[PDB]
Amino acid sequence: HHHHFNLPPGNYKKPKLLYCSNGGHFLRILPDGTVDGTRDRSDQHIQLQLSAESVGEVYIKSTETGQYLAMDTDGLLYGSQTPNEECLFLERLEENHYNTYISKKHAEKNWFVGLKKNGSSKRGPRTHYGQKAILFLPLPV
Template sequence: MRRPPPALPPPPPPPPPPAGSMSPAFLLLLLLLLLPARARRERLPGGAQAGRSAPAPSSSSSSTSSSSSSSSWAAGPSRFPRSRPGRRRGRLYCRVGIGFHLQLHPDGRVDGAHDASPLSILEIFAVSQGIVGIRGVFSNKFLAMSKKGKLHASAHFTSECQFRERFQENSYNTYASAVHRGRRSGREWYVALNKRGKAKRGCSPRARPQHVSTHFLPRFRQPPPPQLAFTVTRPEKKPPPPPPPPPPKKTAAATLPRHSHGPVKYRLKFRFG
């Protein structure tokens, strides 16, 4: 019996290409990708390439502007800044005596003046629910009540500058200290003025919510309401047509009777009797 021929070994794999050589298809693809980029670069003018490096001065200018703005902010706001949103600006009018406006002095005094003045312009802002603070716009100081019930103007906002605002039935407001009150009775101490316009102590027995000296009427400056108006356009009237021309007047010649050249006929009249 014949033996089958032995199986041939598999052919060896092709040797890998050397590291430095590339296939021609890959080289052609790389060349097609590089040509458009080079053509684009040649089309750009000289100033455009310089513009790419231009952001550096802009960053320096922005840093300069930011430094100048930060320095101006560090200098502090103006002495009499505008009222921030959510704050009420106006005057507190107490109807005791001849009527006084509560005012805060730069030296720390608190009193009332009958005539309105820049010292009486106040700014009321909310601290928490039902608690407000009162600041003098001209003096830039806060209304405060000491532990002895004396009213004064403080340069810094502390717990003594917090007051509890309540609305009365007669449309007036009362302001009681949120910190200090009577130790034994627990009665609240209110901001009050006497009939001569001087500040009362909050612990005074005549400074209670039912007394007129503790009632203040807020007079806030509110922006005028927008005027709601509308324009009515009337239809244009057409001019009336011109009157028809008057008929021609009849002349005297036309009114004269016409004479007939024919024979004149006479009718006989019979009279009986």
């Protein structure tokens, strides 16, 4: 365990939007497997179904395309057709409020899901604790 275990409240019963307060983007998994953020609440690719593997581990799945959020070996977020080790994230409470998502595969490197202010996703190595890009709020769809 390389990380704390403060867990966020709530559950996985319903799909969520993952809203990044940094730039005010919803995490988006595009059909072509690219991942970014959009401020467009009506975007069909921001509806995400999270599900638990182990406690505090999640898959994050596009409801629209079925793609799993994943982070590849070079820290790039992508949409995976099938769940693999790159698709597991450690979902944690952060700053007593937000959700963060650390790549389980790369947890020892503290690679987070993050969106920059311009809506582009962060590359894993460019993320770290303390950033704004990594802070998400799950919103109802």
